[PDB]
Amino acid sequence: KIIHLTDDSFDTDVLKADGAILVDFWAEWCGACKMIAAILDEIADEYQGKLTVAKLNIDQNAGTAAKYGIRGIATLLLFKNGEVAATKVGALSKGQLKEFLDANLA
C-alpha cells in the first residue's frame, strides 16, 4: 500500500491529499535510505487508517527534492493538508519511527 510518487504526481498524491502522508525521500546510493526502506512496509500496515506512506526517488525526481531542500540525504517528511507537519533526517529504527509518528499524528 505504499504510493509511488513522481514529480508529475506529487501535487495530487501528496499536497492535495486527504489524511496525513508520510513521504520517504530516497536514492539508490544511500545506505541510510535502505535502513528506512526496511521498516516502511510494516509501518504502513500498522498505521493503516490514519496514515498513507509514499516514496519519492530523488534521483529520478529532482524537482520535488529540490523544493524541500532534501540535498541527497535520507529524509522523511510528514504532510498534512499540503504542508510539512514534521521532519526526520537520516536513518532511524522501527522504534524511533513509531515515536516520530505517534508524536506527530493526531
Residue numbers in the entry: 3 to 108
The authors write:
oxidoreductase family that is found in all three domains of life. trans-to-cis isomerization of the Ile75-Pro76 peptide bond. specific conformation and local environment of its active-site cysteine pair.
Trx0P at 25 °C and pH 7.0. Trx WT, and that Trx0P is more oxidizing than Trx1P. redox potential of Trx0P relative to Trx WT and Trx1P.
